[PDB]
């Protein structure tokens, strides 16, 4: 086709309807489903699909034991038809690694896979199913990328990497690629002290990213990248309605340019649609672990250090395991504004369910309605006892 341009704004977000659910672990009890994690949803001009890091194993396979381990030569970024489980027979391996991101640019698709020793990691960039550019570790400490899709404006796809301490100050870089080649890269700027696992979306020629300040912040950092001038900046979501996990209990006035104190060196990947009054934050119900999942509408959540929920929608109940969550939109769909969407990683097995040696996930992805639709909870639905 032709390089896509984020020309429309966000649609009014009134509720959320289901979009897709793979039910992968339930179907995984009696089928050749693959152990995966860090999934995400991402579209082409012709189809949206499921993306996640496979573990080179089936759930019910003897190698699924140990799969709580994040990195190995055995992981691959794989994609599959929307709402189907990541089966052995139907998955397309995009590239090899233990960290990735991917996005269609209107003409073709760029997929990035990082892999290797912790202190010698590499970022190999593919473009139209061919490897094109290589980026070696700069701070020699777990080079990781988005674990979510990227966003492109006029062939330009900015991607945010991080290399260095999770526990402290690392070297985060926004790379700006075009057809597989770097156009430029620049040091994370603004007031975000640490940045990891960016959930990014585009609207009106500008990409925004709600990331995860792992170090000290319990409110998320935000990077707004201008794909045309090629400059970005960073800040924290002002709302007192905290969204990291673990996180402190909701205070009454937030902090806009500093990490929100309370819990350290830990968190989880989450997203958010900051669109003025059209603002919805996503979070785990518990402040203690990755369980539950809600979508709260906190108008001017980004700018207003005293913004509170005005409306809500429950996704996963507190009793059910949730996890990493991200954003994506079908930038090629018929319409006058972009319909925001998201997914929620629903993890089963280690560490919360130690009666099994595997860790794996299921996906449930939701999209905005302008209508006020009735809610339901979408759990993974697997009886862990069936696996013993």
């Amino acid at each position: 086709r032709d390089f896509n341009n984020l020309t429309k704004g966000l649609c009014t977000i009134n509720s959320w309807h289901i979009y897709g659910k793979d039910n992968a672990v339930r179907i995984g009890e009696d089928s050749d489903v693959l152990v995966t994690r860090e999934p995400y949803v991402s579209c082409d001009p012709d189809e949206c699909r499921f993306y996640a890091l496979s573990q080179g194993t089936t759930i019910r396979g003897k190698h699924s034991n140990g799969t709580i381990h994040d990195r190995s030569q055995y992981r691959a970024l794989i994609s599959w038809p929307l709402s189907s489980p990541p089966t052995v027979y139907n998955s397309r391996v995009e590239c090899i690694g233990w960290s990735s991101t991917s996005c269609h640019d209107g003409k073709t698709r760029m997929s990035i896979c990082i892999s290797g020793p912790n202190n010698n990691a590499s970022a190999v960039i593919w473009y139209n199913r061919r490897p094109v550019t290589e980026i070696n570790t700069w701070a020699r400490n777990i080079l990781r990328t988005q674990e979510s899709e990227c966003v492109c404006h006029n062939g330009v796809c900015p991607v945010v990497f991080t290399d260095g301490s999770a526990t402290g100050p690392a070297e985060t870089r926004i790379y700006y690629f075009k057809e597989g080649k770097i156009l430029k890269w620049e040091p994370l700027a603004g007031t975000a002290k640490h940045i990891e696992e960016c959930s990014c979306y585009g609207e009106r020629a500008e990409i925004t990213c709600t990331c995860r300040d792992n170090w000290q912040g319990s409110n998320r950092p935000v990077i707004r990248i201008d794909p045309v001038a090629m400059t970005h900046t960073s800040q924290y979501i002002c709302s007192p309605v905290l969204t990291d996990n673990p996180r402190p209990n909701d205070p009454t006035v937030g902090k806009c340019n500093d990490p929100y104190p309370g819990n350290n060196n830990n968190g989880v990947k989450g997203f958010s649609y900051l669109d003025g009054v059209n603002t919805w934050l996503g979070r785990t119900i518990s402040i203690a672990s990755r369980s539950g999942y809600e979508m709260l509408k906190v108008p001017n959540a980004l700018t207003d250090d005293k913004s509170k929920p005005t409306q809500g929608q429950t996704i996963v109940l507190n009793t059910d395991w949730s996890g990493y969550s991200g954003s994506f939109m079908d930038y090629w769909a018929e319409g006058e504004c972009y319909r925001a969407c998201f997914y929620v990683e629903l993890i089963r097995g280690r560490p919360k369910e130690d009666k099994v040696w595997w860790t794996s996930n299921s996906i449930v992805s939701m999209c905005s309605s302008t209508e006020f639709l009735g809610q339901w909870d979408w759990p993974d639905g697997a009886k862990i006892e069936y696996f013993l």
Partner: antibody
Amino acid sequence: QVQLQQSGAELVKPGASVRMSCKASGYTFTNYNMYWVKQSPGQGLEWIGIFYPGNGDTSYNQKFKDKATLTADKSSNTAYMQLSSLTSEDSAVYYCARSGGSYRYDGGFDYWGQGTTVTV
Amino acid sequence: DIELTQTTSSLSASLGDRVTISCRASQDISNYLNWYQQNPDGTVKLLIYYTSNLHSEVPSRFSGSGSGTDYSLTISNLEQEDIATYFCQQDFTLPFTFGGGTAA
């Protein structure tokens, strides 16, 4: 009303492992965070961890991570606690409390148990 | 990590008195402070949850106030039943931390 029937005292030597009980009543055991405190003469009230009946979620004050192990019996509506490799430094009155905000982590410990003295 | 410093280890007052026990936290705990009464027979009860909120059946003569890091328990009219130790405790962030307590 709500009630927390803890077990009786324990006398024991080092290296061992005592295992307490906290029997719930007067509420839906499944809808609340069961906390466990350690009032030590000299270290005051210290919080050990949480166990949630609904889904078996747990978390421990890092300090007591290796010593304590929380479990529960939804059947009998009873929370249990098990300290390992006892020492005189683990001698104290172990209390069990309920969450003020049910499944949430706030609202104070609205109901406690009468304690369960361990003596090493 | 958030240390609660329950100032004034012990307290002395005549029956009928107004007493105030102070609990100053290490970090702005954001009104997530609590008060517990531990009777001489070991029994603990929740007095005030969340700075000023009174618990079920709690004697109205028990006022609770404060902000930021400094909070206070105030018993308007002292009574014998009020001879116990008082602990403050925060639930702003895990791990829940208690205050040194104060015997009056």
